[PDB]
Amino acid sequence: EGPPKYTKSILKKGDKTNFPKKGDVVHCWYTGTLPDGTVFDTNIQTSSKKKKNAKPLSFKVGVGKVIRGWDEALLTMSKGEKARLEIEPEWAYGKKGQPDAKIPPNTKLIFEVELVDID
Template structure:
């Protein structure tokens, strides 16, 4: 857009200067209405005699200026810094209950498999996949999902990326990285609730 504007200004200046030399004053679009026939004929002949409509020095200057504008625009694009958003400190804390292998960290998009229990601040359990009875234990499966891509609350996504295979941790997640102002009525999680989890990362695919 800047390039087009610059070119327009250059060419308009060229024609205004040419018309002024021949005392054809006024806006370019109105010259044909205001000039006399003799003035127009003289200007026309002069234009063709000097060949100023062709690739003359003025046109070369225009081309050079256009190139310079393009180079400046390209440099501006290259040097423009990327904007970063500072979100402040993480909205969760993690305490390691059992160390993992300290080697195998999940990456964004990996499938992780977890055992977990979630509690409210008063100790009420609102969700778990850990079964207590022996019959249910046999058929129980860990929760599996792609980590780091928004399949679960952000507190889980961020915390699990810091854990290694076999690690068990206690997580305290602030509302901003949990269910926020809306809460999760179906799970009996009130608005602006801080959540507490015990999570064990049993495997990574």
């Protein structure tokens, strides 16, 4: 189980009342960055689609739909919370990384994650 192979720093507090449980479906805005500061992915729209059509990432939590660091971190977050996650390679894409997805081998990944809603 532990200790966790990720760290969480809370950037914006959530409601501190509604926490996702394993099997809940969550919705999030995220930005993913490498240790060098390069943004590798984001689902946050720059403009004119900021609200018009953009859809947040949707997944069922705690069941291995996402990398381990996200799955465990989400369980610690409350609705509306914005957090910075630093995730070791072992709880991300492993030692090999995911080159076809732009993730280099053996690199920590930094995500800013906002938990919008829980179903």
